[PDB]
């Protein structure tokens, strides 16, 4: 079939549609064509979260295998409550409307790209977040992962830590929203360059697409600035 936007050559069979390169191209066209955005980039300090993840390896017992994923989920969950904007499917009746908080994660399968969703109205314990890492992973291997069989997503993460991320996006459909792709990043803040000074100073990377809002670039920058602050000190989430 046809070079680009073709059905023959492609790695996609492949999640809700997407026969192959044709369908993947046609599907992406839907998102890019209806969704006028501009990715936003931020690096955050996880010198302690990485530390905490290693220290709680014992408690895990590979029950879920503590990955940055679940931590990011809980990270985005609380944050979404504080900033309701971009309410998926608009409405709600309870209680307090906003609209629960069901986040999905991309899962590149031999078939193609599935984004399983994990409930969450406004809550996600370590076990609940981790209880689905293993669950979503197993479903992944069994091609039993499709948002259609339980859509209702508010925001989705694309963890490609196996590389790097510095300002990335490509929203999907209005029914589902995209969070934040992950991949790497180092704060140019291990500033110092002295014989005697901490150096340092790591970072994960956080890139988040976002629909044109009434609000603008000022609101967009404030969101990332606060997200920066939140992940240097995750304890701020507790308060």
Q: What is the CATH number of the domain that holds 50?
A: 3.30.559.10
152 and 43 in a common domain: yes
Number of domains, the chain: 2
62 and 12 in a common domain: no
Active site residues: 212, 216
By residue range, what is the domain housing residue 62? Answer: 36-238
Angle subtended at Cα 171 by Cα 168 and Cα 172, rounded to the nearest 5 degrees: 140
Q: Determine whether the annotation assigns residue 228 to a binding site.
A: no
CA distance 79 to 58: 28
CA distance 13 to 81: 36
Q: Determine whether the annotation assigns residue 53 to a binding site.
A: yes
Q: Determine whether the annotation assigns residue 159 to a binding site.
A: yes
Sign, CA torsion 226/228/233/238: positive
29 and 61 in a common domain: no
User: Strand 103-105 relative to strand 117-118: parallel, antiparallel, unpaired?
Assistant: antiparallel
CA distance 103 to 152: 9
DSSP 8-state class, residue 204? E
CA distance 57 to 186: 25
DSSP 8-state class, residue 92? -
Cβ 202 vs Cβ 43: under 8 Å: no
102 and 11 in a common domain: no
Phi, psi of 209 (to 5 degrees): -75, 165
CA distance 23 to 14: 9
Cβ 7 vs Cβ 20: under 8 Å: yes
């Amino acid at each position: 079939g046809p070079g680009m936007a073709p059905v023959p050559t492609g790695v996609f069979t492949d999640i809700p549609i997407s026969n192959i390169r044709r369908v993947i191209a046609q599907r992406l066209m839907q998102s890019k064509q209806t969704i006028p955005h501009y990715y936003l980039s931020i690096d955050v300090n996880m010198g302690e979260v990485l530390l905490v993840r290693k220290e709680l390896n014992k408690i895990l017992e590979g029950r879920s295998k503590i990955s940055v994923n679940d931590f990011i989920i809980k990270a985005s969950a609380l944050a979404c409550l504080k900033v309701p904007e971009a309410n998926s499917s608009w409405m709600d009746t309870v209680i307090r409307q906003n609209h629960v908080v069901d986040v999905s994660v991309a899962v590149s399968t031999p078939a193609g790209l599935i984004t399983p969703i994990v409930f969450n109205a406004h809550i996600k314990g370590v076990e609940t977040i981790a209880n689905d890492v293993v669950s979503l992973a197993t479903k992944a291997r069994e091609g039993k992962l499709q948002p259609h069989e339980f859509q209702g997503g508010t925001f989705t993460i694309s963890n490609l830590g196996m590389f790097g991320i510095k300002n990335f996006s490509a929203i999907i459909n209005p029914p589902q929203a995209c969070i934040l792709a992950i991949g790497a990043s180092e704060d140019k803040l291990v500033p110092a360059d002295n014989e005697k000074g901490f150096d340092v100073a790591s970072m994960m990377s956080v890139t988040l697409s976002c629909d044109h809002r009434v609000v603008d670039g000022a609101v967009g920058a404030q969101w990332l600035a606060e997200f920066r602050k939140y992940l240097e000190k995750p304890i701020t989430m507790l308060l």
